[PDB]
Symmetry: D2
């Protein structure tokens, strides 16, 4: 894809195995990748939601799982869910607006 | 052995006679009516509470899709289980949301 | 309203004192001992049978991880529900495996 | 990654919405992408397992979900799980051998 492509919405999580680090310490480096990426996101208890260009988002996830390894994880189980609607795109707001009090 | 868990789930219905958002709305209604703490996300809905109670919520959400007209449903679930202390939404997200300042 | 479903699940344990493969082995043992048709895959294990029976299998597999030494477990589940006819493993895979010739 | 990188094992599924096609017809085009890719795979009832290079496998998944759209899907929900162990790699056989009668 490129910056013109219609948006996707995605969620992902990383579950690391680390011999000498606490899980939360390793996960914090994965979330840092998300925080530093520039894309709209929201961290949830089980999954982090992303919105933006497909290839940009997949690269965020790849770098997030690598951040876990760089932080001391020997391995990572990474889960991804993608809502793909390339014709007109899909957004966080269209999926959650009915269900959150912050929306009018 | 705490049965307090955090769980996320989603339902992806097939419904020939319905727009999928309307079907999913009835699944979300089960969650809304349950009494448990929850948050609807773009890809999955997060729940907090007793394992068995939450599993029943998900089962009924799946059934609600069929009752709303779905021919079939693909239901995804993820559970964080930690019986030593239980697991909560706030423990997992406090570092990562502005609302926790 | 057939409750015959196909389900996949996985358990990803944290266990400071154990190699994770050994912990997961005890979860797979619950599946092996259940009596339901199953197949272990690299990323998830597939089950076929009654919805409630299968959910109980997964719950006990998750518990087996803790009993084997896991401090916590992330359990993933996916259910294909189609009460008009039920859903089976063979209906989903027959086109795609050589063993079905 | 490149062809030298240690292997990953991955599973994925596509759940399409198609206004004028049966789900199985659309999914068959996604599995065709897997079949035509050259990588080791196994189709399961809920997920298809892949083994090989990370970027090659992610490209297979991207093309699989696009095949659904080309086949008439208006949108697709795509799920991915990755076992990432870049040091020494991870294989299908190491995870399933104890649990299948075909292994000695």
């Amino acid at each position: 894809s490129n910056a013109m492509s219609q948006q996707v919405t995605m969620s992902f999580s990383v579950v690391p195995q680390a011999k000498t680090k606490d899980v939360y310490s390793v996960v914090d480096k994965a979330i840092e990748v998300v925080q530093q990426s520039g894309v709209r996101y929201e961290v949830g208890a089980m999954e982090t939601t992303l919105e933006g260009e497909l290839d940009v988002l997949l690269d965020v996830v790849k770098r997030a799982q690598q951040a876990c390894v760089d932080a001391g994880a020997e391995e990572v189980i990474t889960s991804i869910k993608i809502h793909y609607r390339p014709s007109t795109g899909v957004t966080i707001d269209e999926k959650v607006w009915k269900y959150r009090d912050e929306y009018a």
